[PDB]
Each structure stands twice: as structure tokens, then as C-alpha cells.
């Protein structure tokens with residue numbers, strides 16, 4: 001019924017909260033644009049290119065509904081979010097640049113919280 | 116570097132442009148071509164100060180920030196009459212009406 | 220250079236270049252050297268002549284275009300003059 | 307898609323410099339892939355920013371408050387080309403030489419409220435001209451017609 005222990009769900013949302021609440025030297029929250037994916041009516045070109053769309057709202061939902069069974073499964077989707085943003089927006093974009101720093105903020109937070 | 120002026124005398128106003136390095140004498144030759152009075156029968160002023168023939172427009176104080184196309188500088192003009200020169204007289208423009216309540 | 224005289228309702232004579240005064244469509248029609256305006260006063264007509272200088276100087280120009288200023292008291296009479304002169 | 311004036315989904319990045327050289331607060335407007343206008347962050351007078359766009363993307367610039375049309379490189383629209391050897395493309399936003407009638411119209415619009423346009427002592431013709439506020443959609447209708455007519 002509950003496939004994940006309380007400490008696993010505790011440390012999972014502790015890492016994602018560090019990525020979501022992260023702010024650069026300017027004071028801008030990098031995750032802001034990545035929290036809500038745009039609808040098919042707004043950006044149909046996003047769904048034509050991206051096969052597995054994902055945002056931070058679906059990642060927090062997947063922690064709440066126990067879909068990811070480990071930290072590696074959580075990373076699988078946080079890296080997919082960043083690769084979808086890079087693939088869609090391409091090199092040079094602020095969204096592409098924000099994705100790279102959010103990838104390192106997830107890995108340094110996983111290193112910190114777990115070990 | 117162009118300077119945009121308003122040469123004024125009584126109820127006459129000439130709109131003209133000149134270079135900042137141009138002299139007051141060269142501006143008197145422009146007035147001669149328009150109003151047919153030679154430079155020796157003219158006196159040009161910036162406010163109440165008489166302008167020297169040898170001085171440039173920039174040396175008199177007419178620059179690109181102070182004499183723009185949309186807000187040109189005024190040059191006072193007085194012509195020779197009989198033997199002496201007339202007093203500098205620039206007839207002012209008419210006043211606009213009171214600003215309405217809708218704009219107030 | 221070719222010049223034209225523009226006379227206001229209160230008798231002020233404004234000597235502007237022919238090329239500058241040609242900015243207005245109404246002046247183009249009556250002019251083919253003098254032009255009289257019985258309903259445009261001097262303070263409005265002087266501001267219309269300042270627009271003709273601003274028009275010719277900054278149209279098709281690579282220098283920065285500054286704002287053409289209009290004071291709140293002259294805005295209404297200048298609008299009626301602009302509509303009547305087509306500029 | 308389908309309108310004549312629209313951005314092309316090129317997927318080819320292009321680095322542009324937006325430079326506001328007007329005394330107005332500028333509103334960059336991007337025409338999306340269906341030709342619909344999208345507002346972008348405003349540029350204060352004299353401000354310049356390096357922005358990221360793509361090849362074949364249509365842009366136009368307006369006054370953020372008044373919606374008056376502005377020029378970009380002495381023209382209505384801006385489409386960035388390809389970065390030749392990683393060089394940025396420059397978009398110089400300037401003020402157009404407005405007609406005296408249109409400039410008079412702007413100043414009276416900024417001083418009077420829309421409800422009091424009929425209260426003025428001006429002729430009938432000028433009330434409709436004053437109520438005809440500038441907007442992106444009408445200038446697009448005029449431009450789509452102009453390049454389709456050409």
C-alpha cells in the first residue's frame with residue numbers, strides 16, 4: 001500500500017524544496033518558469049517536440065503519490081525536466097542556462113542531504 | 116554641428132539653420148539675402164547682449180542642446196534707420212487661453 | 220534658398236524655407252509666395268513652423284529622434300491647426 | 307500559423323541587443339507562431355539588454371503606457387537574421403517622426419480622460435480621431451495588407 005518509508009519521502013521533498021527555493025546572486029528564483037508547464041492550447045509546439053513533458057508540479061505530485069521508489073528515480077525526472085528545457089529552448093536561452101544551474105543544485109543537494 | 120534659430124524683429128520671424136562654427140557676420144549675410152538689408156545696417160542680439168561679427172554661433176552661446184529644431188534659440192535683430200540704429204523691439208506672440216477644467 | 224512668408228491672424232509674419240512649408244498638404248495646394256491664416260494665431264503658427272524644422276531634420280535620419288514637445292496650454296489650438304494644415 | 311505576419315518556428319537561436327533610444331518606456335511585442343502579439347518585459351528610456359530570440363521571429367515595439375508605435379532600425383518590424391560568427395544582432399528602438407496631428411492627439415490623450423473627449427471645443431472629425439487609440443492589432447491589419455498588396 002505504502003511502498004516508500006517516511007524518511008525516503010522526507011529526504012525526497014527536502015532536495016526538491018532546495019531546487020525550487022534556490023535563488024542566484026541577482027535574487028531571482030530560477031525554478032519559477034519550470035513550476036507550471038504551459039497548456040497544449042498555449043504552446044502546441046512544445047508537445048510536438050517533447051515526448052515526456054514534466055514540471056516541478058508533477059514531480060512534487062510523484063513524490064506525494066509514491067511513484068519514484070528511490071533518489072535515482074527522482075533524479076531521472078529532474079534531469080528529464082532539464083533536458084526537455086534544453087532540447088526545446090536550445091543553447092543560449094535563459095531557460096537553457098537556468099536548467100544547467102538547477103541540475104547542479106539538485107546533485108549538490110542530493111550529496112548534502114543523503115550523505 | 117547644426118544650430119536652429121529664430122531671427123526676430125518687430126512682427127517678423129525668420130526660421131533658419133546655421134553651423135555652430137559659422138560666424139555672426141555670416142548670419143547677417145543670410146538676413147541680407149532674405150530681408151535685403153546689408154550686414155552694416157544690422158545688429159544681432161542674444162537676449163539684450165550685442166553679438167560680435169567675428170564671434171562664432173557656439174561662442175555666442177547657440178549650441179545643439181540650446182538651439183534645437185523643435186525648440187530653436189531666439190536671435191534679436193535691429194536695423195539701421197537714417198543714421199543711428201533703432202532700439203531692439205521683438206513684438207511678443209499672442210497668449211494661449213486659460214487651460215480648461217477637462218485638462219486641469 | 221527659396222523662402223515663403225506665412226502670416227498669422229494677429230499679423231506675425233513667419234519666413235520659412237519653401238521645402239519646409241511644403242510639409243503641410245494645405246500649404247502645398249494654395250502655394251502653386253505669401254499665405255494668410257485668419258484663424259491661426261502667432262503662438263500656434265510659430266509652433267507649426269518649429270514642427271516643419273523638426274520634420275525635415277529628423278525624417279529619414281540616423282541620428283536619435285528627440286521628443287517634439289507640446290505644452291498643455293497650446294495642445295488644443297495646435298491640434299486644430301495640424302488638422303486644418305494636414306501635417 | 308496562416309497569417310502573413312507571424313514568427314517562424316525556426317528553432318535556430320539568434321542573440322539580439324534591444325536598445326531603447328527613445329524617451330518612452332518601451333514594450334517589446336513578439337508575434338507568436340499564430341501571429342498573435344505577446345508582451346515582454348519593458349525597457350526604461352536609455353536602457354539596453356542582450357536578449358535571446360530565434361531566426362525568423364517577428365518583433366514590434368510600442369510605448370508601454372500609451373501603445374504608440376515606435377521604430378526599430380528606422381522601420382516598423384524587426385526580424386533577426388543568423389549570427390555571423392557568433393556576433394549579436396542590434397535592434398535600435400527609436401521614436402518615429404510623428405505627424406503634428408498625431409503628436410497633438412497623443413498630448414491631449416495624456417492630459418484628458420477618455421470620457422471627456424467629447425467635452426472639448428474641437429470639431430466633430432477630431433472626436434473620432436481622438437477615440438481611435440493606437441494599438442498593435444490595427445497596425446498589424448495595415449502591415450499585413452501593405453506587404454500582401456506588394
Ligand SMILES: Cc1ncsc1-c1ccc(CNC(=O)[C@@H]2C[C@@H](O)CN2C(=O)[C@@H](NC(=O)C2(F)CC2)C(C)(C)C)c(OCCOCC[NH+]2CCN(Cc3cn4c5cccc(Br)c5c(=O)nc4n3C)CC2)c1
Pocket residue numbers: 033034035036037038043054055056081082084085086088089090093094095315317318324334336346347348349355357358359360363
Ligand atoms: C529582458 C528583456 N527586456 C526586454 S525583452 C526581454 C526578454 C526577451 C526574451 C526573453 C526570453 N526569450 C524568449 O522568450 C524568446 C523571444 C522570442 O524569440 C520567443 N522566445 C522563445 O523563447 C520562444 N521559444 C522558441 O521559439 C523555441 F524554444 C525554439 C522553440 C517561446 C516564446 C518560448 C515559444 C526574456 O525572458 C524573460 C522571461 O520571458 C520568458 C517568456 N515565457 C516563458 C515561459 N514560456 C513557456 C514555457 C514554459 N516552459 C516550461 C515549464 C515547465 C517546465 C519546463 Br521543462 C518548461 C520548458 O522547458 N519550457 C517552457 N516554456 C518555453 C513562454 C515564454 C526577456
